[PDB]
Write an enzyme that holds these catalytic residues in place. Structure first.
Site, mmCIF file in Angstrom:
data_model
loop_
_atom_site.group_PDB
_atom_site.id
_atom_site.type_symbol
_atom_site.label_atom_id
_atom_site.label_comp_id
_atom_site.label_asym_id
_atom_site.label_seq_id
_atom_site.Cartn_x
_atom_site.Cartn_y
_atom_site.Cartn_z
ATOM 1 N N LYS A 37 3.602 -10.683 9.050
ATOM 2 C CA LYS A 37 3.174 -9.612 10.968
ATOM 3 C C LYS A 37 1.927 -9.281 10.713
ATOM 4 C CE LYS A 37 2.526 -5.638 12.598
ATOM 5 N NZ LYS A 37 1.369 -4.195 11.788
ATOM 6 N N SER A 78 6.555 -1.295 11.042
ATOM 7 C CA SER A 78 5.800 -0.429 10.879
ATOM 8 C C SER A 78 5.400 0.806 10.473
ATOM 9 C CB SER A 78 4.438 -1.588 11.616
ATOM 10 O OG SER A 78 3.295 -0.301 11.785
ATOM 11 N N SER A 79 4.307 0.885 9.668
ATOM 12 C CA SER A 79 4.666 2.259 9.200
ATOM 13 C C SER A 79 3.586 3.391 10.398
ATOM 14 C CB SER A 79 3.456 2.396 8.387
ATOM 15 O OG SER A 79 2.784 2.093 8.388
ATOM 16 N N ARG A 80 3.106 2.340 11.257
ATOM 17 C CA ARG A 80 2.121 3.133 12.719
ATOM 18 C C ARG A 80 3.118 3.152 13.488
ATOM 19 N NH1 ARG A 80 -3.092 -0.472 13.364
ATOM 20 N NH2 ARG A 80 -3.962 -0.291 11.260
ATOM 21 N N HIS A 100 8.746 -4.326 3.807
ATOM 22 C CA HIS A 100 8.609 -4.486 2.528
ATOM 23 C C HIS A 100 9.632 -4.629 1.609
ATOM 24 C CE1 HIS A 100 5.269 -1.545 3.334
ATOM 25 N NE2 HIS A 100 4.356 -1.855 2.696
ATOM 26 N N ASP A 107 8.772 8.644 -3.536
ATOM 27 C CA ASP A 107 10.354 8.522 -2.568
ATOM 28 C C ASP A 107 9.705 6.580 -2.536
ATOM 29 O OD1 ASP A 107 11.560 7.606 -0.501
ATOM 30 O OD2 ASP A 107 10.488 7.596 0.489
ATOM 31 N N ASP A 108 8.694 5.834 -2.602
ATOM 32 C CA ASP A 108 8.953 4.800 -2.842
ATOM 33 C C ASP A 108 9.232 4.211 -4.254
ATOM 34 O OD1 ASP A 108 7.040 4.567 -0.754
ATOM 35 O OD2 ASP A 108 4.943 4.795 -1.890
ATOM 36 N N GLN A 153 12.893 4.046 -3.648
ATOM 37 C CA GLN A 153 13.267 2.843 -2.985
ATOM 38 C C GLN A 153 13.810 2.013 -4.894
ATOM 39 O OE1 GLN A 153 12.617 2.328 0.984
ATOM 40 N NE2 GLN A 153 10.776 3.521 0.326
ATOM 41 N N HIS A 168 8.727 0.386 3.548
ATOM 42 C CA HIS A 168 9.226 0.373 4.847
ATOM 43 C C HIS A 168 10.515 -1.279 4.633
ATOM 44 C CE1 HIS A 168 6.991 -2.468 6.814
ATOM 45 N NE2 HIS A 168 6.119 -1.695 6.840
ATOM 46 N N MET A 176 0.564 -0.804 0.205
ATOM 47 C CA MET A 176 0.173 -0.007 0.108
ATOM 48 C C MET A 176 0.723 1.091 -0.040
ATOM 49 S SD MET A 176 -2.978 -0.626 2.183
ATOM 50 C CE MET A 176 -2.292 -1.016 3.765
HETATM 51 O O1 BZ2 Z 1 1.661 -2.546 2.373
HETATM 52 C C1 BZ2 Z 1 1.775 -3.665 3.161
HETATM 53 O O2 BZ2 Z 1 1.259 -3.486 3.897
HETATM 54 C C2 BZ2 Z 1 0.162 -4.120 2.112
HETATM 55 C C3 BZ2 Z 1 0.190 -3.495 1.029
HETATM 56 C C4 BZ2 Z 1 -0.862 -4.931 0.826
HETATM 57 C C5 BZ2 Z 1 -1.750 -5.262 -0.798
HETATM 58 C C6 BZ2 Z 1 -3.284 -6.165 -0.941
HETATM 59 C C7 BZ2 Z 1 -3.162 -6.900 0.560
HETATM 60 C C8 BZ2 Z 1 -2.175 -6.572 1.932
HETATM 61 C C9 BZ2 Z 1 -1.272 -5.640 1.853
HETATM 62 O O3 BZ2 Z 1 -0.810 -5.374 2.599
HETATM 63 C C1 BZ3 Z 2 8.839 -9.067 6.228
HETATM 64 O O1 BZ3 Z 2 8.500 -8.136 6.906
HETATM 65 C C2 BZ3 Z 2 7.082 -7.616 7.330
HETATM 66 C C3 BZ3 Z 2 6.787 -6.458 8.083
HETATM 67 C C4 BZ3 Z 2 6.701 -5.883 8.036
HETATM 68 C C5 BZ3 Z 2 5.479 -5.256 7.082
HETATM 69 N N1 BZ3 Z 2 4.210 -4.676 6.885
HETATM 70 C C6 BZ3 Z 2 4.186 -4.548 5.808
HETATM 71 C C7 BZ3 Z 2 4.722 -5.487 4.901
HETATM 72 C C8 BZ3 Z 2 5.641 -6.017 5.776
HETATM 73 C C9 BZ3 Z 2 6.944 -6.672 6.243
#
Ligand code: BZ2
Ligand code: BZ3
Ligand code: BZ2
Ligand code: BZ3
Lengths: 288, 272
Positions: free
Chosen positions: B144, B180-182, B46, B72-73, B76, B43, B39
């Site tokens: 995760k 996590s982005s959070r 990903h 930025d994405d 990367q 980070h 999404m």
């Molecule tokens: O960036 C993420 O954590 C992510 C993206 C994404 C797209 C479709 C289904 C699940 C998903 O998790």
């Molecule tokens: C592979 O490790 C991770 C850890 C946190 C994440 N959040 C979204 C993708 C993702 C992957």
């Protein structure tokens, strides 16, 4: 890959087997056609097979599977006609090369777990009294499409609402298959082909011509507008002994959230005794 | 005609049809197409998915960036040697609005499906669509979001999808906090307390030689030592998120709220 003998009918029960053969065929350049059926094949099904066969380089896969998920209790599932001997014989005679005849266990090893939820169209018409029917249909068709991965999939227009919902499935999930609708095959008097026609006694068989007569009368009356088309159909149905109408509706061709313009579809469902019959026809409003 | 594709460069496509056409053409040339759904706001988690995808021999990597309802994405991804980014609009993904959708099995109403009863239907719908657009040989997800990973495996099995689902172990900060982005939203007190999620899980994983209850009790004790950590659940399940077997392999999952931020973590557990 299990064995595939071309120019002969090859029957596979295992999803893995047909998937392997399909994949192999597609890689050697054959175009895979899928005709999904619930067996009890009639000339309507054979028209689908023939349409598939006409595509150059095609290999035709006909699936036969009575799908428990599109039936509600009790009742209906046990009553669906099963004639596998006739079916496979008809397929051999048509030069179909693949029949796919999976078990319930192979299709539903986890019962009903992930399923397809149709759009709002599934709640209307046929779906009104049978709110889970089209979820069952779309789930099985999705699965068949994933197993077989055909280039094109073939359905009759007789089950028009089903065809439209399948086009929705294909569009909405970005499925890489072309949906081909084939015009309804009819008996000499106009009666639409159906596996349910066998449940009409001689009297009901006679009365049943009124569905197709009502529809074709409406199509011709339609130069005079929608009210005239509908009233002509209603008049024919009213003239028919012991045809009990469930619905008669004129909709847009997509059946959906849009008003009728110049092109529509007239759909009818009616009971003859305990036998429920469907038919539909293209309608042009103000066009001769 | 197949859209332009320049090997060894980041090729960006917004039209589902274009990426569909390029992916088909590439697969015919002897490439194995790998899909990494995201999404955006990428980070290190990903990037671990990307790296896993890249090490498959013959791989071409497709990263989708789509917010289920930037430069930025893309830099990367470029820096990672990713050759395809798929960046559709909502209208491109949902031209006919929300119509046919995926209905998950009953697992979707549990755990994360408590607060968000329709969350996973959204996720499985978009994942099914991406699988159909891209038709990858393999699709990569972080561990995760374990419940999400399990529901995707159920999607794949139930709909007879011809793709391998690869779960990639969770990338963690130095102190164990799951990426996590959070995380950026946590103030310093919260960020210090947040370590209790991973610390509770790792303590449980080691306590597990003494049995299931010892594992759960060890994790609860650790979470109990943290201030301002509101535990939403702490649950030991089998690896498919059914009931925990009396012995054998399982998964321990936790979710908690720190102020306005909800955090999740999970870990493999071997019982006894
Ligand atoms: O960036 C993420 O954590 C992510 C993206 C994404 C797209 C479709 C289904 C699940 C998903 O998790
Ligand atoms: C592979 O490790 C991770 C850890 C946190 C994440 N959040 C979204 C993708 C993702 C992957
Ligand atoms: O025999 C039929 O009329 C038939 C079979 C079938 C299989 C899957 C979905 C719809 C279907 O309709
Ligand atoms: C193409 O003509 C038809 C007519 C009735 C049908 N029932 C099931 C398939 C089918 C096809």
């Amino acid at each position: 890959i299990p064995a595939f003998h071309p120019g002969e009918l090859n029957v596979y029960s295992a999803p893995g087997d047909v998937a392997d053969v399909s994949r192999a065929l597609r890689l050697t350049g054959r175009r895979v056609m899928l005709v999904p059926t619930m067996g009890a094949l009639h000339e309507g099904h054979l028209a689908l097979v023939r349409a598939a066969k006409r595509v150059p380089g095609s290999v035709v896969v006909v699936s036969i599977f009575v799908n428990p998920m599109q039936f509600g209790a009790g009742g209906d599932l046990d009553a669906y006609p099963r004639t596998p001997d006739d079916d496979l014989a008809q397929l051999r005679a048509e030069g179909v090369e693949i029949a796919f005849t999976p078990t319930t266990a192979a299709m539903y090893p986890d019962g009903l777990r992930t399923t397809v939820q149709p759009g709002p169209l599934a709640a209307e018409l046929e779906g009104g009294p049978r709110p889970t029917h089209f979820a069952g249909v779309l789930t099985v068709v999705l699965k068949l499409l994933q197993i077989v991965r055909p280039d094109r999939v073939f359905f009759g227009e007789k089950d028009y609402q089903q065809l439209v919902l399948i086009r929705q499935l294909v569009a909405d999930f970005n499925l890489d298959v072309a949906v081909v609708g084939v015009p309804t095959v009819r008996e000499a008097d106009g009666l639409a082909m159906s596996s349910r026609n066998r449940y009409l006694d001689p009297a009901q068989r006679a009365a049943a011509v009124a569905l197709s007569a009502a529809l074709t009368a409406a199509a011709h009356a339609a130069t005079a507008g929608a009210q005239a088309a509908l009233d002509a159909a209603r008049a024919v149905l009213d003239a028919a002994p012991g045809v009990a109408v469930d619905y008669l509706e004129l909709r847009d061709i997509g059946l959906g959230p849009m008003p009728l313009n110049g092109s529509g579809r007239l759909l009818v469902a009616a009971r003859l005794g305990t036998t429920r019959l469907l038919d539909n026809i293209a309608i042009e409003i103000g066009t001769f």
